[PDB]
Design a protein around this ligand. Structure first.
Ligand SMILES: O[C@@H]1[C@@H](O)[C@@H](O)OC[C@H]1O
Ligand SMILES: O[C@@H]1[C@@H](O)[C@H](O)OC[C@H]1O
Ligand SMILES: [Ca+2]
Length: 223
């Protein structure tokens, strides 16, 4: 998160950390045993770290669960990042309380203009490198399909939307991938890609979760 703020410990209770010896992606808890993430975040040996604020300190509320199975979207294209969504099944059910909670899947797509919560442990600087130990939060509106398609010609599919600010200075960034974009209490986006971070006329590009509620729900009822 570039240009955001310190969320506060456990105030984003659906935010997870993907850990393979080190934080490498975010993810979003949607029920006690399933995390949704970015498909380009896929790797073998994933442990899912719930209840995290400082990812380099044990603080009192963590749950560490190994993945038992990962499902990259059947149609994920790593070249275009089209359909950048993946589901992770947890080996044991997380124990749900006020600091470890699932976030509701949409019944509707969020409209251009709607302001959302983007959170992650990604790089906080746009020209330079610096990674936080605590979770960082950004409120960013959704942007119109017509300025999204302009900012990134030939690259925006119906499976993506842009969210952010075209004057730059505020974005998600490397290390935020897999993580939530929440609007009106609905996991609407998944941190996916962009050109740099916090750059003018280059807003964050997010996987459009509402296209995948049918794929998510029928996957989760059969696995
Ligand atoms: O974003 C672009 C992607 O859509 C694809 O075309 O590969 C090149 C990238 O610049
Ligand atoms: O039991 C685990 C604890 O030992 C570890 O410190 O962090 C995750 C917990 O689930
Ligand atoms: Ca911790």
């Amino acid at each position: 998160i570039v240009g955001g703020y310190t969320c506060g410990a456990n105030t984003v209770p659906y935010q997870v950390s993907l850990n393979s010896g080190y934080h490498f992606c975010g993810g979003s808890l949607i029920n006690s045993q399933w995390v949704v993430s970015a498909a380009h975040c896929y790797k073998s040996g994933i442990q899912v770290r719930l209840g995290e604020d400082n990812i380099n300190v044990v603080e009192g509320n963590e749950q560490f669960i190994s993945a038992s199975k990962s499902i990259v979207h059947p149609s994920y294209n790593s070249n275009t990042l089209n359909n950048d969504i993946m589901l992770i099944k947890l080996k044991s059910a997380a124990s749900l309380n006020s600091r470890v909670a699932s976030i509701s899947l949409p019944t509707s797509c969020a409209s251009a203009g709607t302001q959302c919560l983007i959170s992650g442990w990604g790089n906080t600087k746009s020209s330079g490198t610096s990674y936080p130990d605590v979770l960082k939060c950004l409120k960013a509106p959704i942007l119109s399909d017509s300025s999204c398609k302009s900012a990134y010609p030939g690259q925006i599919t119906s499976n993506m939307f842009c969210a952010g600010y075209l004057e730059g200075g505020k974005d998600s960034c490397q290390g935020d991938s897999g993580g939530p974009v929440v609007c009106s209490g609905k996991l609407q986006g998944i941190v996916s890609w962009g050109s740099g971070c916090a750059q003018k006329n280059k807003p964050g590009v997010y996987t459009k979760v509402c296209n995948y509620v049918s794929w998510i729900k029928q996957t989760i009822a059969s696995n």
